[PDB]
Design a protein around this ligand. Structure first.
Ligand SMILES: CSc1ccccc1OC(=O)N1CCC[C@H](C(N)=O)C1
Ligand SMILES: [Zn+2]
Length: 139
């Protein structure tokens, strides 16, 4: 679980969005596993606008943060799950690091701010949904 709170927006994994997120929907993209909903309170986070390929992510299944080197956002095949059929997920960045399904929503940050959230993983890999291209999050 986990979200990014920026301005009057909440960014969550689309597969974990709640009834309230869908009732206050701003934008969603199943191909990216992202959903953004509106909030009444001003958010705590800031978004990186950079090309960093290293950073630190939070891993809830270890209660720890880990440093990672990750690939640039790209189209990657993701096997079927209870949430989606087998498909290509876009704007996904892979890295070597521990993750389990419940880790989705953990933030990845570089020295410039929030880069993205955990969205996929497996066998010593962890994948992050990039948010750096969503310029409208802090217009
Ligand atoms: C950190 S997720 C994870 C980690 C290890 C093993 C499996 C994991 O589950 C995934 O890769 N899934 C399940 C939830 C939806 C994901 C998606 N974005 O399509 C794909
Ligand atoms: Zn950066």
């Amino acid at each position: 679980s986990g979200a990014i709170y920026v301005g009057n927006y909440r960014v969550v994994n689309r597969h974990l969005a709640t009834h309230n997120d869908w009732a206050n929907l701003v934008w969603e993209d199943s191909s990216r596993d992202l959903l953004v909903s509106s909030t009444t309170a001003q958010g705590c986070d800031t978004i990186a606008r950079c090309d960093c390929q290293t950073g630190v992510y939070y891993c809830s299944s270890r209660r720890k943060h880990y440093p990672v080197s990750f690939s640039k956002p790209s189209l990657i095949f993701v096997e079927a799950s209870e949430y989606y059929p087998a498909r290509y997920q876009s704007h996904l960045m892979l890295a070597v690091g521990h993750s389990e399904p419940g880790d989705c929503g953990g933030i990845l940050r570089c020295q410039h701010g929030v880069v993205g959230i955990v969205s996929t993983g497996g066998n010593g890999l962890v994948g992050f949904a990039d948010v750096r291209d969503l310029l409208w999050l802090d217009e």
